[PDB]
């Protein structure tokens, strides 16, 4: 089972280098090429360079030559990319891809790097119960508000992941150097508030795991 496991999200200050790791499992690490691809948010794909885990052999894109350096450790079977002095135009999603000539077969999740020079802030979770008044019926919706956090992302979960079918998770939009994001779950009136529906919110930078039960107001 061929897999590529990339590291988590990254928040960096301008003028600081960063290493991005890509763990490979399910195949012989030293026999296949590994290509690296950059993705500017809301834009296309950019090839950065390839690395052959066997021995020191790399070819880079001329646009990335003096910025990206590729290394691979054979013992840990991990491909690593260092990006020197990150700017505003470097805040992107970086991918690692396994290539068997001449197409990229397997991919990693992609590490979201944001630069970004702001302070890391704690998220605030708020439960959204239906409008005041003892029920309405048929099928009622529930919401979860995550107000004022930095940086991306926030993983939203409902009841640990059991009721994840009628869920609308909304992409985060930046306002005054702060991110805001919401999620809504639509369920039948028979299963609420008879069945306890909880909001699970996780944030990596602040290291906060706030769990809030939605109770009628």
């Amino acid at each position: 089972q061929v897999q590529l496991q990339q590291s988590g999200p990254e928040l960096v200050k301008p003028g600081v280098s960063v290493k991005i790791s890509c763990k490979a499992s399910g195949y012989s690490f030293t026999s296949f090429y590994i290509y690296w691809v950059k993705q500017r948010p809301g834009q296309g794909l950019e090839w950065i360079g390839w690395i052959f885990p066997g021995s020191t052999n790399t070819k880079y894109n001329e646009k990335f030559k003096g910025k990206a350096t590729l290394t691979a450790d054979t013992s840990s079977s991990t491909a690593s990319m260092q990006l020197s002095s990150l700017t505003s135009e470097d805040s992107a999603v970086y991918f690692c891809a396994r290539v068997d000539g001449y197409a990229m077969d397997y991919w990693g999740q992609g590490t979201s790097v944001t630069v970004s020079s702001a302070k890391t802030t704690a998220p605030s979770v708020y439960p959204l119960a239906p409008v005041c008044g003892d029920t309405t019926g048929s099928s009622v919706t529930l919401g979860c508000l995550v107000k004022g956090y930095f940086p991306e992302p926030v993983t939203l979960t409902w009841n640990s992941g059991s009721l994840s079918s009628g869920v609308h998770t909304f992409p985060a939009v930046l306002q005054s150097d702060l991110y805001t994001l919401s999620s809504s779950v639509t369920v039948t009136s028979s299963t609420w508030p008879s069945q306890s529906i909880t909001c699970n919110v996780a944030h990596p930078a602040s290291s906060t795991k706030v769990d809030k039960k939605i109770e009628p107001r």
Binding site: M104, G133, T186
Partner: protein, 217 residues
């Protein structure tokens, strides 16, 4: 280095119909004998998935309905028939020489029957008041098409300052859109006024769906 352009930039195709995607090249990638053109499918939040390599040869696990063709500079990808889970941005990449370049992007979207949004208004939580904030949330779930405008009204008068909007990507099953709007206000501004209405105009009906709540309860 080798410019790859994709036409059209965006196409709308009904469920079960044929979609044509072109990929023009600035240099002949088919050099040496065979075409070195690859095709990818990328859903939002996910890495690109290889569909067809060398214009003709499909990757194992990819259905036969995904068909690619072309030689020299002109290349085409077709999906027949299309399904609900085909909502993605498709890319063509080239090997050959010399720094590897991706295409230009062509977003696929599905046309279906027009749907009316189920509007749900949510008052600020009791924990928001303690922190000093007041955010009124309004969810518009499962509607078609994407074109929709949300207008906030406080005590009969429109408010445009502090409105945060976010639109979701097309559903992988329903092929519908969803939107959320929030009035980022303070506790001081919230307690002065009483009525808060969430209004949305759509192509489905001339009358706007108005969902409102009173603080008086």
């Amino acid at each position: 280095d080798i410019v790859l352009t994709q036409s059209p930039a965006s196409l709308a195709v009904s469920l079960g119909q044929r979609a044509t995607i072109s990929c023009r090249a600035s240099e002949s990638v088919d050099s040496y004998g065979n075409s070195f053109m690859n095709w990818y499918q990328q859903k939002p939040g996910q890495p690109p998935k290889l569909l067809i390599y060398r214009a003709s040869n499909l990757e194992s696990g990819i259905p036969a309905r995904f068909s690619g063709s072309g030689s020299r500079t002109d290349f085409t990808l077709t999906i027949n028939p299309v399904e609900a889970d085909d909502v993605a941005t498709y890319y063509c990449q080239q090997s050959n020489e010399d720094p590897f370049t991706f295409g230009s992007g062509t977003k696929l979207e599905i046309k279906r029957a027009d749907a009316a949004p189920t509007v749900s208004i949510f008052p600020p939580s009791s924990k928001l008041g303690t922190s000093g904030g007041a955010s009124v949330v309004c969810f518009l779930n499962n509607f078609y098409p994407k074109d929709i405008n949300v207008k906030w009204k406080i005590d009969g008068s429109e408010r445009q300052n502090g409105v945060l909007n976010s639109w979701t990507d097309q559903d992988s099953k329903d092929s519908t859109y969803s939107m959320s709007s929030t009035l980022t206000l303070t506790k001081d501004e919230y307690e002065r006024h009483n009525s808060y209405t969430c209004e949305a105009t759509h192509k489905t009906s001339t009358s706007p769906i108005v969902k409102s709540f009173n603080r008086n309860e």
